Structures are given as structure tokens and as C-alpha cells.
Amino acid sequence: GAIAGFIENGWEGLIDGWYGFRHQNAQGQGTAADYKSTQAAIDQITGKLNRLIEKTNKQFELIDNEFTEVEQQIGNVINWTRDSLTEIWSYNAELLVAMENQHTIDLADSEMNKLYERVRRQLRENAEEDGTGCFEIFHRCDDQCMESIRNNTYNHTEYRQEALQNRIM
Amino acid sequence: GAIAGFIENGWEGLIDGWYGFRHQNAQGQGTAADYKSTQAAIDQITGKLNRLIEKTNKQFELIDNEFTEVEQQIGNVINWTRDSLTEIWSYNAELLVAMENQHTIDLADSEMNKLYERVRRQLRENAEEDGTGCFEIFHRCDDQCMESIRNNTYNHTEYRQEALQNRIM
Amino acid sequence: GAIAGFIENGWEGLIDGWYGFRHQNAQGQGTAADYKSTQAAIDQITGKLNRLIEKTNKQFELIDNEFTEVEQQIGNVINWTRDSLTEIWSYNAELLVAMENQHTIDLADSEMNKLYERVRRQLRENAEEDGTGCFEIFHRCDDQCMESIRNNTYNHTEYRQEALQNRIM
Amino acid sequence: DKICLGHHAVANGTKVNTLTERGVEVVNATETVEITGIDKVCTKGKKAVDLGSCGILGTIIGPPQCDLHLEFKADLIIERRNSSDICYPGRFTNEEALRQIIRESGGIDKESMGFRYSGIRTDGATSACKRTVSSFYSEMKWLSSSMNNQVFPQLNQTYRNTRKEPALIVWGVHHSSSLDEQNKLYGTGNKLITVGSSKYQQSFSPSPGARPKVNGQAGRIDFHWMLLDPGDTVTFTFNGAFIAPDRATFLRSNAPSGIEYNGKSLGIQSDAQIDESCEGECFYSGGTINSPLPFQNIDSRAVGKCPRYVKQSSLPLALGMKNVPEKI
Amino acid sequence: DKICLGHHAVANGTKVNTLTERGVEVVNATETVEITGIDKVCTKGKKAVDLGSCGILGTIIGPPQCDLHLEFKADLIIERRNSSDICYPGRFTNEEALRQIIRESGGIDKESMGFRYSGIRTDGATSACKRTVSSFYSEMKWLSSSMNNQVFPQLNQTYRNTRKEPALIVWGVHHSSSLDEQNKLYGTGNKLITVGSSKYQQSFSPSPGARPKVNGQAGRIDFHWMLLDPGDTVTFTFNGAFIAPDRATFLRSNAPSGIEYNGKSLGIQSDAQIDESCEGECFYSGGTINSPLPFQNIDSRAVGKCPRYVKQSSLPLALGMKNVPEKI
Amino acid sequence: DKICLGHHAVANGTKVNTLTERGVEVVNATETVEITGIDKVCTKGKKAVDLGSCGILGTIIGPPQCDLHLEFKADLIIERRNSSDICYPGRFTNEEALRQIIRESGGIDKESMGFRYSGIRTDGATSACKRTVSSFYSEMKWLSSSMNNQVFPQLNQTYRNTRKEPALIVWGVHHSSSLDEQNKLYGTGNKLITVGSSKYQQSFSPSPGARPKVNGQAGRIDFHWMLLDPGDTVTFTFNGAFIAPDRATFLRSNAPSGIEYNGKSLGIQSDAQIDESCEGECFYSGGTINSPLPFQNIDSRAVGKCPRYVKQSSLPLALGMKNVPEKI
Ligand SMILES: *[C@@H]1O[C@H](CO)[C@@H](O[C@@H]2O[C@H](CO)[C@@H](O)[C@H](O)[C@H]2NC(C)=O)[C@H](O)[C@H]1NC(C)=O
Ligand SMILES: *[C@@H]1O[C@H](CO)[C@@H](O[C@@H]2O[C@H](CO)[C@@H](O)[C@H](O)[C@H]2NC(C)=O)[C@H](O)[C@H]1NC(C)=O
Numbered sequence A, B, C: 001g002a003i004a005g006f007i008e009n010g011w012e013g014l015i016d017g018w019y020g021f022r023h024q025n026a027q028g029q030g031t032a033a034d035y036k037s038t039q040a041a042i043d044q045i046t047g048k049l050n051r052l053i054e055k056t057n058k059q060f061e062l063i064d065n066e067f068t069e070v071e072q073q074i075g076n077v078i079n080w081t082r083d084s085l086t087e088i089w090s091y092n093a094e095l096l097v098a099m100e101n102q103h104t105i106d107l108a109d110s111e112m113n114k115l116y117e118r119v120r121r122q123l124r125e126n127a128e129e130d131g132t133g134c135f136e137i138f139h140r141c142d143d144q145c146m147e148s149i150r151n152n153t154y155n156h157t158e159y160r161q162e163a164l165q166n167r168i169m
Numbered sequence D, E, F: 001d002k003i004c005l006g007h008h009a010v011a012n013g014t015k016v017n018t019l020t021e022r023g024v025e026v027v028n029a030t031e032t033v034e035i036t037g038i039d040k041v042c043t044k045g046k047k048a049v050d051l052g053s054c055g056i057l058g059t060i061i062g063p064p065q066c067d068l069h070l071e072f073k074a075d076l077i078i079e080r081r082n083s084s085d086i087c088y089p090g091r092f093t094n095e096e097a098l099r100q101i102i103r104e105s106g107g108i109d110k111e112s113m114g115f116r117y118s119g120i121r122t123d124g125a126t127s128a129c130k131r132t133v134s135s136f137y138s139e140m141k142w143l144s145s146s147m148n149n150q151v152f153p154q155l156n157q158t159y160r161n162t163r164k165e166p167a168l169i170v171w172g173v174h175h176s177s178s179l180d181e182q183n184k185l186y187g188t189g190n191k192l193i194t195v196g197s198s199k200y201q202q203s204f205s206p207s208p209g210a211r212p213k214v215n216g217q218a219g220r221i222d223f224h225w226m227l228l229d230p231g232d233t234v235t236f237t238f239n240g241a242f243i244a245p246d247r248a249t250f251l252r253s254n255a256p257s258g259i260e261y262n263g264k265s266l267g268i269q270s271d272a273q274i275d276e277s278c279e280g281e282c283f284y285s286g287g288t289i290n291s292p293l294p295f296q297n298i299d300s301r302a303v304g305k306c307p308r309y310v311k312q313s314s315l316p317l318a319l320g321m322k323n324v325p326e327k328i
């Protein structure tokens, strides 16, 4: 029952946010979703499907008549031109979606690292990376300390010397 | 009046380069733009707007006549085909620009980190990251030392032991 | 005759893999290609050129006749429409290739760092980065230790204290 | 004594394609192709007319069918399949081109061309246009000799387009059932009709003969139309076989905002009923297409403000991060 | 005491373009544009017919040329350049439209329309259709007065489309070399031909005159065709100058899988030989295009399952990482 | 004791769209759509001709208008709006197709077809072609009976294309003002004209009548043209009503580099003046489009080496890094 982070795994457990903190200390185990980075991912995702409209919509009218056929010589060309244009628009939509899709998958990976990098830099010399996306903390960090790491107030000087003795011998 | 780097901020002050070093030490404060990475960003940016030409230019002639109209049955189709093709080329140009634009914005972010990563690796164990994009240096670095960090000659052994005592106790 | 890694250089020598380890220790010098990350790059690369088919192929028939010409008024339009569509498909293929190409070049750079980051995190506090893509190891690592680093079994505790004395004084 | 950074995952996420790879599993996804349509015409907040049995071109010249719709005002105009533009067998010259004008008209306003006649039967009636009793096109006069086999008068008419909007003018040439019937109707000898406008002139002659019996008539009437600029005279000159406009047709989207004006209609062709409760800007033969999605697989030929048409039945769009199921 | 991480490189890698930059050197690359084609028609595993001298439309009405191919069954149909659709000078109405039907037919099955004649020469022969001795179209009868200058009979024929597949019906109008020859052949006075179907009716009259001498004939025969729905009668009525269908043409891809059925052909135009050893799904005037690559620069107008056509002779696709040559 | 890494920023950078996000502020940007054009035709370093009043087709047959431009040599050819191809009312068969040939010709060289006449008036003149005194097309002869109401001679002419370049040949059919005038001019009885080439043959007959009076003439002349391969004879045979070519028209871009040769022109339609000081490769009705930018919003129908046409008035292109304004 040890705990790991994003590197190797996803948390089926985290259910009130996209990205989150999982911790353990003398008090026990906690999980909190992180709001700001969740909203950041979500904001970039919403407006998708509205972006695809407003890029691909047009105003058009009848060139050929279904009820009484126009002349076949020209009629053939209009069908040929219409099918050829559909090939082009089909190619385009399948590509535009695969782009927007590459982009959602990637920027999410991006928001995770944005956050982890923040925390690494925040802990300075008091913590070390296990490499599952987790930080090993060489001081005693307790549920009001954890919330500091999270709420972005962790002051690394308050614990530095403790951590350094704990880290070297 | 403390100084920070790129992580959170841009320097309105840096006006002879794209990327730069801001330092302080016993002597005072200095700012130097960095040439090589500036030129690297700039080289990739120039040739934009020449790249868009040479991808999107064609040679063409009159199919319909403005001065005396060609037959309306065919005339309608040529207008329809021309408008439909314009839809396609419009879609394409707005996408190609949004690509080249995503690319300039991104590769710039890229040149910054290329440079900062260089410097982090260059300082080895003598410095630590505040996390605003700045390095805290645990030895006495002086205006000829700073230029070394910049001109890529900083030898970390010359200052290592000084830095390590300064860093641990 | 010192050895460097990917940062500045490619290895013309590595010829049974895409990515690899180059080491030296008391025993001498060794090079091993890494299989898993090679296969990972290769798998993403193969299926290219099959992906481009299945995106760009169509079923079509004769609209104009080479052997006896159809009427010139319409004949002109079909040539005009066909050339205009070819402009569009040409633009598209040159872009789709330049994408798939940007992607192969980039994901390769990606697999290298995936691997180096793994190893950095694996060595924890026992090694330091020269910055040519190489790790300086502050303990005695020997050909069965090297294979551990590679085969992903390096246990950093077994050597930590040795490395820390070796690193600080 | 530790802290871990993570992202959410779910047990059974949907597969989406990316440029790099195919069928990547992810947390959430949405469809981008619309494939079901509303089989109604969605006319809410729009002013719509269902011609029904009325052919569209018939609105101009008035068969009994088109009696309701002679002066219709419409934002959206719906043609229907079995509709007949004509009561007495004939066809419009430039027919497909003429309708496209009408569909986008906004509707049409009619005013009398002011023609008057001296010595002729103008009340020509046919079995084909029944309407309580045999009748003709509502908007035209059928001109006859006033005594059987009496040679028809060389006559001239000029009408000039007073209004700012270009007028629509339609006229007829009658091809009689037999060489006899032409004689009985218009007298005997050479028959010539000439139509003159500042941009338009042409001459028509009947080519009388039997033709397959439609609506009970071997004879045919052919309609030719023109657009008349303001201040322009159309001159009508004929010795017979001529079907004469009584009224000029004016588009409503050329009006001066003088409350006739009802601008810019979309004319669709639909098999579906009407529905003033639902809302639509895209229409096709099946009904309306109204959808949050940006593509449709439903019909190539859809018209109005429409989702782009694509071959594919599905392209699924990612709405969340890549799904990485949790490990032991 | 060290460990290094690296990637492979080579001395002389190929240059590839990327969106960002041009001619980036890389380890491996492949061509994506196909530029050489197989100059054969690759028919392996396909059922193919080379009409050769046969014009395609000629398969319907049977000149001596098309004798082999009257009832052909084909998956792939190859037209050839000097091929003549006709033995006695004439041309098909809607000709280009007619062929496109045939190319995709699958081939054609023939059955007799059952016509019989009473008092006429039906055995009309010409220098133009030689075939051991002077002859005519295999699938038609040439109808003559049976005594020179004898006025030709007003006759009527009805044929009704029994089969489920729509039938193909072709008929002729003969324009005689001289005003005399019409007289000698069909007698004297007015000549009228009318063709009637539930969707089709039209009337034809000879306009006899000299025309430039082709195949040794100043006279011309013009072919008009129709598609007949099942259960529909085509009625033939004529006082002369009429070339009569003997057989109806049925497409094979409208068959009920009753073993005539050979579905859905692609008709190509090719100058190349045939080859049942090689395989192809894309064809052009030069030969087949079969290639691993996804684009071709070879021909705009290629048909079949084809690589996309592009202006460019090369776009080279990266197959490996960016090449970074080794340093001192 | 510290070192910081930074990038530049500015106070008020421009907003640019990216695929991800809209209106991202950045340090620098440039416009990519060209929206203003040079309202001149920019002909510097190019050889240009302004036909002006001259219709283009008129260059072939020589009305008084086109007197300057009978043998013009041009890289760029500019048609103008009120230009009239004809002095005596008529129209070219395949007219739009004929011009497109001329626009890309390079200009045209003329040489005499060598025709000579025996017993006819060839000097036919009209009020329509005034030119000091009444006159005709510069490049044709008008053929008349030489005595009023005298029946016109059955004549034959053959001209053969000696030159390597395919010749351009134009001829006329005259439809006389009245049935009388045809008689007065060409005598009485049947009138037939036939034109024969190895690829071309057709027969023309006058259909004499009054038509609306243009240029003071009820009569019309219709021009028919052909392209003649080298070594090919065009044979002219006519009993009258025939307007005869005096000179053959040869394109300059089919020349053998024998210094007539001036290859490959672009023909534009423009309302703008000319300017040999400025430079252009793209033209439209307004003027030239010359621009560093790669797109234009100015005109769909622009011709020459042109920027792509796009709906949008602006797409702004980033030229610098994302702008991140400095903080307290
Ligand atoms: C997950 O994706 C779905 C679509 O698959 C989103 O749900 C739609 O939400 C809108 C707004 O309520 C509704 O109008 C649609 O009916 C929903 N469609 C379906 C099929 O669910 C949902 O918003 C997304 N949520 C997250 C967190 O990803
Ligand atoms: C390197 O790229 C080449 C193509 O440039 C690949 O080789 C092709 O390989 C297939 C499979 O054997 C053959 O059918 C083709 O004939 C080869 N083409 C050429 C010109 O070599 C090769 O697979 C790639 N290998 C690597 C390691 O990149």
C-alpha cells in the first residue's frame, strides 16, 4: 500500500478534479484535487466543438434540382465537382479533429508537468524525487505542512536544516 | 527591488536582445542580452512570410468574361466552383497561419529553456533554482565570473568547495 | 578520448540500435543499444506510408474523353476544375508530409529524453550531470553495476553513502 | 514521509484517433458528426410558405393550383415533388434559371401592366385550367380572332418599367394542336411574334403540330421571360399565337422598405412536414438539420446555414486527458 | 567513472523538409511520390476485355468490328484509340453519356425484341459494312420499300420491357445521300418517325443531302437510344428512313445473380498492352499504376483505385531521427 | 548573490490567433492579407498593348477601330469595356473560346491567303465601317454580283497551310437586310456555303430577314473560324453571301524564334490606366496586385502570378515571442 504519482499511473480514485495531490505522513493519507490547474485544462478544452463550428460553416443554395433534373452533360460535372469537394472537406475534418485531439492529449500532459515542476522547485533541497511522480520529504511534514505545499506557501527555509541532516547521514 | 526571470515575467527593460541575463552580486546589477539564442530565434522567424509564398501561389487565366457574360447555365457553375474553392483556400490560409503562429510562440519558449537548461547544467552544484527562472549562487560571483557564466566558460570546480560549505551549513 | 552523450552529438558507432548507453569504469569502455526505446521509436515510425494511404485514396471514373474530345465550353471547365483541385491536393500532400516529418524528428528527440530522464531519476543522489548527456558517478560502478543502470534495476541505496562522501569532500 | 502528484483516470474511457496514433483511449469524448436530422421543416421565427401542389414557376403566371400564392411573402420557400408549374402543357425557356431567381426573391408583388385590347377574344379558356368552369392562367390573357378563322390583327404593345426594382415579364407562344386549329384560332398565313427590350430582342413563330396528349391537350404554350431594368420598354408585336402578360412580377427583396419589402429568402426542396415549434437554419429533402455538431453525414446537397458535409459517419473528438488505467 | 546516453547517427543521411525548416538532414527517408508506371494493363485476377478496333458504342449495335464483343462479360473494359463505333457514317445522340453507361455496365446481355415485318426489304446491306459480302449492323435491320421508288407503309411497333433490369434500346434515322436516294429507298412525300415511351417521346425526320464522303458514303445514320424501365412500352411509328432495333441490350450489373450477372466494371482508355501476370487497381493511358507510395505525379486523369495526383515529383518522408554527425 | 534568465517584452503588443487560443498577445506581428491594389496596370519590363476601343476578336478581321493592332506583338494584352469586336453587326461562332486563344497568343502575324477573283465586286463597302469613306473589314473582301440582281457564280477556293504554326482562318456568312437585298446583292435562288478542312467541314446558308437596327444595319455578318494544321487545305465553296478571308492569322508563340516570335502572353480585362514605371505579375479589373503578402482579399477573379484569394480581410502572423508584460 505505497503511493505513486502520474509517471506510471492514473488515479481512478481522484474524482473531484483533473490533477491532484496524494500524500502520507505521521497523520495518515490524504488526496486533494487541485483546482487551478484543473480549471486551466478545462478552460482550454471547453470551446472545442465551438471552435470547429465557425471554422467550417457556410451559407449555400441549390445548384441542381432533385425534383426535375437539369441537363445531364452539366449534371455530371456538378456531381463530380461536388464529390471531389467532399473528398477535400472530409480529408480536412478528419485532420482537424486529429489535430485538436493531439492537442488535448498533449496539453493535459503539459498541465501535469507544469504543476510537478512548480512543486519540485518549491521544495528546493528538502525533498527528492522517487521518480513515480512523487516527492520524498526529508523533514516531518504534517497535514498543515502538506496544505502549504499545495496552497503554494511552503517555505523551504523553515525546514531546510532539518532536511539536510536527514538527507546526508 | 529583487530580480526574477522568465518564469513569471517578461523584461520590458531588455532592449538589445530577445533573451538575456540579469544578475546581481557584490558589484551591483547588470543586464546583457544573449546574442546567439537571439539570432537562433530570429533566424527561424525570418523566412516566415516568404514560406507562406512559395506554398500558396499559382499561375492562372480568365475562364469567364466580365465584359461580355458567358452562358448562364455554365456561368452559374463557374461561380459555384470558384466560391467553393475559395472556401477551401480560406480555411487553409487561416489554418496555416495559426500553425506558423503556434510555432513561433512555442519555439521561443523553447529557446528560453534551451538556454536556462544549459546554465543549470553549467553551474552543477554551485547554484540552486529560486524558481522564477533565477539561480542562487552559493559562492562569490563577481562581474568577471558572471561573464563566464554567460560566455559559457564557467568552470564549476574553481568554486565547488566554497559553494558546498556555503550550501550545507 | 573522453565520452559524451546526445546533447551535442550523435554516435556513428552505435549500430544495433537507435538509442544507447556508453560507459567507462575501472574495467574499461562499453556500448549497448537499448532495445525497448528503440522498438518504441520504430513502432511509431512504421505504419508511416501506410497512414498516408488510407487518408488520401479514392475511387473514380472518366469524366472527359481523351480519344474523342467532349464539347470545348464544358471541356475548359473540367480542365480548370481538375487543375484547381490538384493545387489543393498538392498543397495538402506537401503539408501532410511536412507534418509527419516534424513528428518523426520530434518524437525521436522525445524518446531520448524519456530515457535520460528515467536514468537521472534512477541514479538519485549518486550521480551528477556533466551536461553532454552523461552522468558522472560518485561511486565505483562496475560492469555488473552498469548493466543494472541499464536493465533498470540500479538500487541507489546500496551505493548512496559511498557516493555522498565521494561527492561532498 | 511523502507527496505524490497525479491526474485522474477512469476504468472504461472512449477511443479517439490522433495524427500520430489510432484509437488512443481517453477519459471523455464527444461526437463531431451529426447523422440524424429532424424530419420536419423547422420554421419557427421564420416566415415560411409551402407551395405544395403548386409548382414554383407557376406562382408567376397563375394556374388554378397557384391561386393562393400569387402575391406570397416568404423568408423560406418550400417546393414539393409532384407540383406542376403549368395547367396547359408547355415549358419555360431557361426554367431552372428562372426558379433560382424566385427562390431567393423574398416573395413577389404583382401590379397590372395596363394592357387593353380592341377587337379580339381575350377570354380564352381551356379544359386544362378548370376552376369552377374552364379557365386560363390567372395572370395572362389568351388572345383569339373573335370570329373563327378570321385573320388576326398586326398589333403592338409597349410597357415600360416605372418601378425602381427590375420587373419580371412573362409571355407565351402558342403551338396549336393542328395546322387547322391555328387557322381556326388565329386565322391563316404567316405568324410572327417579336419581343423587344433595350437589352432583349427575339422573334417567335408557332410550329403547329400534334404532340403527345398531356392534360388532354396536344397543343403547347411556351413561356419566355425577361428582366426589365427601370425606365425600360418591352415592346410586344404579334399577328397572333401570342399569350399576353396581364401583370408584372416584382421581387420583394428589391423593394424600398415600403412595407412590401420582405428581404432575402432561401428556397428549399423538401418531403417533410412543417413545424413552427422547432428551429432551423439548415434544410434538406428529409427535413431540417439542426445540431451542436460541426459536420453532417446526412446529405451532400443540404442548403442553408449548414454543417460541413463529410463522408465519415464518425470522428470522435477528445474532451479529456489520455486515460491511463490504475495499476496494482 | 561515467555513463552516457546517446542516439545513433550516420555519415551521409538524406535531406527532408519540415514545416519549420527546409532540407533537415536525417538518418533515413522514403519517397512518397510514385513517378514511374507499369506500361501494361495489369489484369491479373480480373476479367478484362480489349475492344481493340472496336469502338465501345459499337458493342450495342454490331458493326463487323464489334463482332466478337456483342455479348461480352467484363470487370475491366479497355477502349482503344483508332476504334470506330460505326461502319456506316453516323453519330450517336448523347454519345459521351452513352459510353459511360457501358463502361460501368459489367458487360452486356442481348435478347431479341421480337419484331417481325410483312411487306418490306429488311435485309438492307451496304458497302460500308463488308463482312464476307456487303452487310449491315449485326443488331439492327435496314428497312426498304421492296420495290424501288415505292411509297413506304405507315407502320407501328410496340416493344415492352419484360425484364427487371432497365433495357437499352437503340434506333436509327437515315439521311439519304441525295433527295433521289430517299425516294428510291423510301418512296416519296413526307417522312416522319416518332418514338414513344412512358418517359420518352420524340419525332425525327430525315434531312436528306450530300455530306462529305466517309467510308464511301455521303449518307448518314443517326442513332438515338433510351433506357426503358421494366413494364414499359416503347412504341415505334414510322413511314420510313427508319433503322430498327432487332435486339435489346441489358446490363449485367442489373442482373439478379442468375449467372449472367457479372457486376460493376471500370472502363479505361489505354495505349498499353495487356498483362495477366501483374496486378493493378489504378490505370491510365500509359498503363497501370501500382505502388506502395500514396501519391503519383504520373497522370491527372488516372482512374480506378488511385494514389492521389500531385504536382510535385518528390516529397521525401522521414523514416528516422534527425541526423547529428559525430564530433571530434 | 544571483543570476536570472529572461526574455524581452513590450508594453502594448498585437493580438494574434493560434489553433489553441484566440487573440494571444505577442511582441510583433505582420499582416498576411493584401487588401489594397495598385490601380494601374503595371507593365514595367513587359511588352504591353492596350486595345482600348478595339474589341480583341476585331484584331483578327480589322474593323476601323482595330487598325493599329492588326499585327500586334504583346507579352501582356489588355481588353477594355466598351470595345466592339465588329463594325458591321454580327457575332463570332465560339466567341469566348476564340478570344482565349488570342489572349495567350503573344500577338499575331498576318500573311495573305493569296485569293484572287475574276467577275465579282470584291470592294464591298458599308456605312458601318466608315474610315475616311465607307469601307469594310481590313482583312476580308465583301463579294457582290458586279451587276445588281445578277445571279452569283458557283466558286471554289483552296488555301493550304504552308507554315509550321497552325493558321487561323476566319470567314463570313452574310444575312441580308431583306429578302430583296439578298437578291440585289447575290442574285436569286438557293444560296449554299460549304467550308472544308481535313478536320473541319460545314455548310452555311443565309437566313435573310430584318433584325433590330444596330450601327444602322438590319443585316448581319457571322464569322466562323478554324485552326488549320500545317500542310492542310481549307476549301471554300460558295454561290454567294460569303465574306472571304484575305489574310491568315498566325500566332507569335508558334513561331520558330525567327524574330517574329514573341512568346506566351497573358490577356487581362482592366479598367485602369497603364504605368510603365511600376512592376506587376498579378492583375485584376481594378489594376495590378503587387505585394509582399501571400494572400489577397481584393478580387476572386484576378489573373497572372497571384497571391491566393481568401475571404478574410485579415489574418495576422506572429513575428515574435508571446508577450508577457512585466510585473511589479
Ligand atoms: C464529457 O463529454 C460529454 C460528451 O460526451 C459532455 O456531455 C454533453 O454535455 C452537454 C452539456 O450538458 C449536453 O448538452 C450533452 O447532452 C452531453 N452529451 C453527452 C452524450 O453526454 C460532458 O460535458 C463532458 N464532461 C467532461 C467532464 O468531460
Ligand atoms: C529505411 O528506409 C528505407 C526506404 O528508404 C526502407 O527500405 C525499403 O524497405 C522495404 C522493405 O524491405 C523495401 O520493400 C524497399 O525496397 C526499401 N526501399 C529502399 C529504397 O530501401 C528501410 O526499411 C528503412 N530502414 C530503416 C532502418 O530506416
Ligand SMILES: *[C@@H]1O[C@H](CO)[C@@H](O[C@@H]2O[C@H](CO)[C@@H](O)[C@H](O)[C@H]2NC(C)=O)[C@H](O)[C@H]1NC(C)=O
Binding pocket: F028, F029, F030, F031, F319, F320
Ligand atoms: C516586426 O514586424 C514588422 C512588421 O509588422 C517588421 O517590419 C516590416 O519590416 C520591413 C523591412 O524593413 C518593411 O519593409 C516593412 O515596411 C515593415 N512593416 C511594418 C508595418 O513595420 C519588422 O521587421 C519586425 N521586427 C521585429 C524585430 O520583429
Ligand SMILES: *[C@@H]1O[C@H](CO)[C@@H](O)[C@H](O)[C@H]1NC(C)=O
Binding pocket: A155, A156, A157, A158
Ligand atoms: C521563510 O522562513 C524564514 C524562517 O526564518 C523566514 O525568516 C522568512 O520570512 C520565510 N519566508 C520567506 C518567503 O522567506
Ligand SMILES: *[C@@H]1O[C@H](CO)[C@@H](O)[C@H](O)[C@H]1NC(C)=O
Binding pocket: B155, B156, B157, B158
Ligand atoms: C576547472 O578548474 C580546475 C581547477 O583546478 C582546473 O584544474 C581545470 O583545468 C578547469 N577546467 C576544466 C575544464 O576542468
Ligand SMILES: *[C@@H]1O[C@H](CO)[C@@H](O)[C@H](O)[C@H]1NC(C)=O
Binding pocket: C155, C156, C157, C158
Ligand atoms: C535497496 O538496497 C537496500 C540495501 O539494504 C535494500 O535493503 C533494498 O531491499 C533494496 N531494494 C529496494 C528496491 O529498495
